[PDB]
From Swiss-Prot, chain B:
Domain named PID: residues: 14-150
Name used for this protein in its record: Disabled homolog 2
Gene source species: Mus musculus (Mouse)
Posttranslational mods: Phosphorylated on serine residues in response to mitogenic growth-factor stimulation. Phosphorylation during mitosis is leading to membrane displacement.
Tissue localization of expression: Isoform p96 and isoform p67 are expressed in adult kidney and fibroblasts with isoform p96 being the predominant form. Isoform p67 is the predominant isoform expressed in embryonic visceral endoderm.
Modified positions (Phosphotyrosine) in chain numbering: 139
Cell compartments where the protein resides: Cytoplasmic vesicle, Clathrin-coated vesicle membrane; Membrane, Clathrin-coated pit
């Protein structure tokens, strides 16, 4: 499904 | 075979990869992540785009450019760079389980999140994968550099 960005912020 | 950091670097270096698509819409969102949250936006935006289509209004034709610079939304007609989102500003990539030719991503700083819904000219998956690999590479490189400074 969906996934987040490890290097976000 | 195996998409090594080197292969990935060479792929997203400079102009990187480019995909033909259409901008379904933009929506202000309450959080940086979330399948349900992303689905609700996509659905609302597709609802809106539909109402527009029934009145002769079509989605803006664009180029989704993926590189180390992040994502660039470019107008297909003018070549004007409408939006640019650095990798460190894209918090979530949303897969649209209802469409094989659509996906979205959330971007912006904390407290100012936006969902960009995109209709791919071709299949969306290869695009979602690229973004995943991109975030993965950026990550690997930074990690090494850290273990080197230490």
């Amino acid at each position: 499904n969906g996934y987040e960005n490890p290097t976000y912020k | 075979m195996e998409k090594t950091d080197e292969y990935l670097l060479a792929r997203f270096k400079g102009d990187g990869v480019k995909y033909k698509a259409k901008l379904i819409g933009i929506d202000d969102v309450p959080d940086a992540r979330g399948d349900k949250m992303s689905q609700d936006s996509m659905m609302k935006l597709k609802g809106m785009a539909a109402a527009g289509r029934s009145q002769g209004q079509h989605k803006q034709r664009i180029w989704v450019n993926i590189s180390l610079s992040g994502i660039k939304i470019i107008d297909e007609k003018t070549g004007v760079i409408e939006h640019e989102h650095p990798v460190n500003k894209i918090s979530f990539i949303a897969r649209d389980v209802t469409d094989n030719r659509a996906f979205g991503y959330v971007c912006g700083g904390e407290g100012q999140h936006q969902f960009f819904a995109i209709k791919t000219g071709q299949q969306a998956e290869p695009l979602v994968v690229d973004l995943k690999d991109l975030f993965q590479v950026i990550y690997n490189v930074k990690k090494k550099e850290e273990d080197k400074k230490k």
